[PDB]
Amino acid sequence: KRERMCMKIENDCIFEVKHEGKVTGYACLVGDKVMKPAHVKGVIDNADLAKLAFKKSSKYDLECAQIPVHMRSDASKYTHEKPEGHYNWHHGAVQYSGGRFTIPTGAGKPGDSGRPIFDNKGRVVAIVLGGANEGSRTALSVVTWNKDMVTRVTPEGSEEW
Amino acid sequence: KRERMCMKIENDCIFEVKHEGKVTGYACLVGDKVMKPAHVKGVIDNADLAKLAFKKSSKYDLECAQIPVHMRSDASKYTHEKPEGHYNWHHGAVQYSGGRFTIPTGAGKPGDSGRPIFDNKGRVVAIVLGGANEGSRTALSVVTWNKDMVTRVTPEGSEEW
Amino acid sequence: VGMSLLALISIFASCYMLVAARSKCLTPYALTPGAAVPWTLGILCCAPRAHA
C-alpha cells in the first residue's frame, strides 16, 4: 500500500542523470522546482529538463530550476514538518532520531544521491547527498527545508555518493 | 523487558576505567560526547577512547570529549525532562522526589561513579558522582542537565565514590 | 630594560586573563549536546567554527 504508492511516486518524479553512459545521480521534481544535487555531474535524460537554466549555489550543494507547465501535475507535494519516527525511502525505511537521518540497513552506495526521502502521506522531507559511516549505521547528509529556508545537515566524516 | 534493554544499552555504551589494575569508574557515551567524572582518575579500558583530548572543568567535576565517528551508533540517547516518579538504574530503582535522587537501600559502593541513571524509555537523565548517607536512605550527588546547561547537584555530606 | 619587562609582563597577564575568561565562559557548552548560541559565538571566538 504505502510502499506501492511511494514507488509509483518515485517512478513519476525521478529522472536518471547519466554521465559517459552510466548513471551517477537522480534529479527529482518537488513542488514546482527541479532539484538536483550540484556535486554530481552529468545530464538529465529529458529534453525539457536538460535545456533549463540551472541556478547554482555551492553552499548548499544544490541546483534548482523552474519546471515547465506541462510537468506540474507530475510533481510531488512538499512539506516542512519533521516529526520524530520512521520515514520511507527507496532502499528501505529511514529513521529520524535526534535531528539526524540514519539508515537501518547501512547499505549506502555511490550513485544514489538525489533520491527524495518520503513521508508517511507521500510528502517529501529532504534530499539525499551522502552519508558518514556510523559503523553498522550511517548518518545521512541531507538537504531539508525550513518553513521558508534551506538548510544543509552534514554529519562528520560524510562522503558524497 | 525494560531490564534487558537497559542492560543491552549499558553493555554497548559503558566502559570501565582501569587504574593500577583496579576499576575506579565508568565512562559512558551519551549523545555525541564521552563522559567521565573528573575526580575519578585512570585511563579508559579502550584503545580508541584513550587517545581523545578531554576538556576538564572542575566546577562541574566532569571531563568530556567528542566521541569518534565509528562509535557514534553505539551511544545512548538523552533527555532533559525529569517528571516526578521513579527511574531505573543498574543497582535497582531510584526515587526522584522534590528534585532529589535517593537510593532506597543505600547499596552504592565506591568505584561505581560514572554509571548513568536511565529514564523509563531507556534515555539517560544524569550521571552519578557520589552519595550522602541520610539514615536508611542515601541521597545522590549527581550531575544533571537543563535544556542546555549542566547543573551539579550535591546534597550536604556527600562523599565522592 | 625594567620598563620593557614590566610592560611585557602586564600585557602577557592581560592576554592570559582574557583567554581564561573565554575558557570559563565557554566551558559548560562542551558538556552538553547543545548549540553554542551564535550571538555568543560571534563575540566569543571558539574552536568549532561550523560544526556543533
Catalytic residue list contains B61: yes
Alpha carbon A77 to its chain centroid, in Å, reads 13
* Cα–Cα distance measured from residue B81 to residue B104, given in angstroms and rounded to the nearest whole number: 22
Instruction: State how far the alpha carbon of B44 is from the alpha carbons of A51, A67, B47, B142, C1, in Å.
Output: 59, 56, 8, 21, 50
DSSP assignment, residue A143? E
Which H helix or E strand runs over C13? helix C2-25
In chain C, whose CA is at the least distance from the CA of B127? C31
Helix segments in A15-89, DSSP class H: 47-50
Q: Which of C28, C29, C30, C25 is nearest to C43 (CA)?
A: C25
Task: Tell me whether residues A133 and B69 touch, CB distance under 8 A.
Answer: yes
Nearest CA to CA, how far is A99 from chain B (Å)? 11
Catalytic residue list contains B39: yes
Does residue A110 contact residue A161 with C-beta atoms inside 8 Å?
yes
Does residue B124 contact residue B112 with C-beta atoms inside 8 Å?
no
Does residue A125 contact residue A137 with C-beta atoms inside 8 Å?
no
Helix, strand and coil content of chain C, in percent to the nearest 5, comes to 65, 0, 35
Helix segments in chain A, DSSP class H: 2-12, 47-50
Does residue A117 contact residue A127 with C-beta atoms inside 8 Å?
yes
For chain A, the straight-line distance linking the first and the last C-alpha, in angstroms and rounded, comes to 29
Q: Which of A108, A112, A106 is nearest to A40 (CA)?
A: A112
Query: CB B17: neighbour CB atoms within 10 A?
Result: 23
Nearest CA to CA, how far is C51 from chain B (Å)? 12
To one decimal, the resolution in angstroms is 3.5
Query: CB C22: neighbour CB atoms within 10 A?
Result: 14
Choose the catalytic residue: A76, A113, A141, A158.
A113
Q: Which residues of C touch B (CB under 8 A)?
A: 27-35
Task: Tell me whether residues B73 and A98 touch, CB distance under 8 A.
Answer: no
* Nearest-CB residue to B64 (from C31, C34, C35): C31
Catalytic residue list contains B19: no
According to DSSP, the β-strands at B100-103 and B137-145 are: antiparallel
* Cα–Cα distance measured from residue B46 to residue B27, given in angstroms and rounded to the nearest whole number: 10
Choose the catalytic residue: B19, B39, B90, B91.
B39
What are φ and ψ of residue B108, in 5° steps?
-65, 145
* Residues with Cβ within 8 Å of residue B144, at least 6 apart in sequence: B82, B125, B126, B150, B151, B152, B153
* Cα–Cα distance measured from residue A102 to residue A140, given in angstroms and rounded to the nearest whole number: 6
Cell digits for B21?
Answer: 589494575
Residues β-bridged to residue A88? A93, A118
Task: Tell me whether residues B72 and A136 touch, CB distance under 8 A.
Answer: no
CA angle A32, A33, A37 (to 5 degrees): 150
* Cα–Cα distance measured from residue A138 to residue A157, given in angstroms and rounded to the nearest whole number: 10
Residues β-bridged to residue B37? B62
* Nearest-CB residue to C33 (from B57, B59, B78): B78
